[PDB]
Amino acid sequence: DMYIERAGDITWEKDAEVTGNSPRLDVALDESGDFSLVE
Amino acid sequence: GETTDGVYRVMTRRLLGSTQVGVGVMQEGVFHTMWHVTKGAALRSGEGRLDPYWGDVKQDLVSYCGPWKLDAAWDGLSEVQLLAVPPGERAKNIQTLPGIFKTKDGDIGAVALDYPAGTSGSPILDKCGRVIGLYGNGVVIKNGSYVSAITQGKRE
Numbered sequence A: 001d002m003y004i005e006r007a008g009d010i011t012w013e014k015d016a017e018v019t020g021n022s023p024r025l026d027v028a029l030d031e032s033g034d035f036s037l038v039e
Numbered sequence B: 001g002e003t004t005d006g007v008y009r010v011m012t013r014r015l016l017g018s019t020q021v022g023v024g025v026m027q028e029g030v031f032h033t034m035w036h037v038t039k040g041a042a043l044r045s046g047e048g049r050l051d052p053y054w055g056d057v058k059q060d061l062v063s064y065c066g067p068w069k070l071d072a073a074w075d076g077l078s079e080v081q082l083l084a085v086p087p088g089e090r091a092k093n094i095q096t097l098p099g100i101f102k103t104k105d106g107d108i109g110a111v112a113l114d115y116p117a118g119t120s121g122s123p124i125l126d127k128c129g130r131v132i133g134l135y136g137n138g139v140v141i142k143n144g145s146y147v148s149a150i151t152q153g154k155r156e
């Protein structure tokens, strides 16, 4: 049986750790909600 | 039981000890998570029970107690924050500029931050503090890392 516990508030934090890139990828979404890369 | 607006961990005692399976957003008395986290199964919140209300395997979304309430969208230009809630680790805002998932039915925003699967359901926020989508459904790229779509539902 699954259960839930509060983890925090939903707020934008200023001066948060800025990381990660912005890639443009060709994808396909199937009837099972699964993505796959197209080339 | 606990219906306070905020981010929550989705846990289970079926495996060894307590295992985090995902994360979800409580907003307006509705619990919003990704379908693959609960599989549409009922949830427990202390002594209270959360029964599913709306679900969809292709969208990979699910709501509890009421209809989907999150309606904010990524604007295509601004940086966003993933409020990552990783297993056994404290909640954390990670700012990023999302990429694009180009599909046959249109484009979607995409966060390129890699996290364990138990992070699934973590909200992606805009500068106003509004939930623009959920983290947990994307792809594994050439280098093995995960790039998740910004998955948002529809408010009726």
Ligand SMILES: O=C(Nc1ccc2c(c1)CNC2)c1cc(F)cc2[nH]ncc12
Residues within 6 Å of the ligand: A032, A033, A034, B036, B060, B115, B116, B117, B118, B119, B120, B121, B135, B136, B137, B138, B146, B148
């Ligand atoms: O496995 C993951 N996501 C997932 C699983 C099962 C299903 C769907 C998505 C949608 N259809 C069913 C996952 C999520 C994540 F946040 C980080 C990850 N790193 N490697 C993998 C994943």
